[PDB]
């Protein structure tokens, strides 16, 4: 149907906008702390601590399959990256502090992304 095509075009355009958001958020992580999944070979206890691991590569895979239907879903995965790190790692660590800085800087980007998603529809 043409209605199904139009819905698919909207999902494609959302995907384009979320790719630009993803790039901008990841630039706020120049150390690349959040680039890849935590390795269970290197942190064998991780899944005892963290039940839903998340990282920028995993989000990019989901994005390229057009797997985010709305901005809320994408924000959920970004918040997991930050929140997981702030639980596993202590306050005094470079990991925790990187997460705080990513959250603070990413807030700016996401605030305008929301306006754009609502505005364009």
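^ structure tokens above, recovered residues below v
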């Amino acid at each position: 149907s043409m209605e199904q095509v139009a819905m698919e075009l909207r999902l494609t355009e959302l995907t384009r906008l979320l790719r630009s958001v993803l790039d901008q958020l990841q630039d706020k992580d120049p150390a690349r702390i959040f680039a890849q999944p935590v390795s269970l070979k290197e942190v064998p206890d991780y899944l005892d601590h963290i039940k839903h691991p998340m990282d920028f590569a995993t989000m990019r895979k989901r994005l390229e399959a057009q797997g985010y239907k709305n901005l809320h879903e994408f924000e959920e995965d970004f918040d997991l990256i930050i929140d997981n790190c702030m639980k596993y790692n202590a306050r005094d660590t470079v990991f925790y502090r990187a997460a705080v800085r990513l959250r603070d800087q990413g807030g700016v980007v996401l605030r305008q992304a929301r306006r754009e998603v609502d505005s364009i529809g």
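The first helix runs from residue 2 to 27.
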